[PDB]
Amino acid sequence: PYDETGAQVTSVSSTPFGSLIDTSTGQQILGTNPVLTSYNSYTTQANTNMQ
């Protein structure tokens, strides 16, 4: 599979969730946004707060 700069890379580099840019703000998402911590603790988070 191709990558940026037209180079074929043998391994995939994941795009970090925290590096995504908000559409309604124009800025990268924070490190303390609730969904990020929810993803980082999904087991306990969904077990406790049922969200």
């Binding site: 840019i21 124009g26 800025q27 990268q28």
Partner: protein, 51 residues
């Protein structure tokens, strides 16, 4: 007026404004000083996302 040679000019693409810093009061009046990004980010949050 700002000079056309030796001047400083900056542009923020998130706050999408052209800004320039000028030193007036003591001590820095005629001597250039370095303005940290984190403290200038207080008056312009966009500098935190896009340099």
């Amino acid at each position: 007026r700002f000079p056309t040679s030796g001047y400083n000019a900056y542009y923020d693409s998130v706050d999408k404004v052209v800004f320039v810093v000028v030193s007036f009061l003591y001590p820095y009046t005629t001597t250039s000083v370095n303005i940290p990004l984190s403290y200038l980010s207080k008056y312009l949050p966009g500098l935190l996302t896009a340099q």
